[PDB]
Design a protein around this ligand. Structure first.
Ligand SMILES: Nc1nc(SCCc2ccccc2)c2[nH]cnc2n1
Length: 154
């Protein structure tokens, strides 16, 4: 029992783009751009769709960099999140109803105002390593169990 989601990180040589989530799931935390994958689109098409909806950006190419599975206590469906990276983007990011975008220097990442699992795997993304992760949550703040490894194929 699982459902597909996407997450996109725009990572340039000296900065990374994050959005402050204004409503819905994860509101009040900085994150990459993404959401549910729809019927009739590929996983990559869904990532591009969410990036455009939430920031206005389009891209030449997306690269697969990780997979993370989330379990929330008392929720029947696991979340299967496919994580993508890009350097080159097309456009200037703008605010949407869902997200307020800002650039961050790579030594000033706001981990205290991010999902707690990001402190574990985001460092691997910044180091350009591919990864598989699993995190079990009780509510939105408490990690009960986790696994994390580097992989050769995402
Ligand atoms: N960084 C991060 N992201 C997510 S969900 C990302 C994808 C998403 C899904 C549904 C609505 C909008 C966005 C997380 N969940 C639990 N820990 C987490 N960490």
């Amino acid at each position: 029992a699982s459902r597909l989601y996407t997450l996109v990180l725009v990572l340039q040589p000296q900065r990374v783009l994050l959005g402050m989530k204004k409503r819905g799931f994860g509101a009040g935390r900085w994150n990459g751009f993404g959401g549910k994958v729809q019927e009739g689109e590929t996983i990559e098409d869904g990532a591009r769709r969410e990036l455009q909806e939430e920031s206005g950006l389009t891209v030449d190419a997306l690269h697969k960099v990780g997979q993370i599975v989330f379990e929330f206590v008392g929720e029947p469906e696991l979340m299967d999140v496919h994580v993508f990276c890009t350097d080159s983007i097309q456009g200037t990011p703008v605010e949407s109803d869902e997200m307020r975008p800002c650039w961050f220097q790579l030594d000033q990442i706001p981990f205290k105002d991010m999902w707690p699992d990001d402190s574990y795997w985001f460092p691997l993304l910044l180091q350009k390593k591919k990864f598989h992760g699993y995190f079990k949550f009780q509510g939105q703040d408490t990690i009960l169990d986790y696994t994390l490894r580097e992989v050769d194929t995402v």
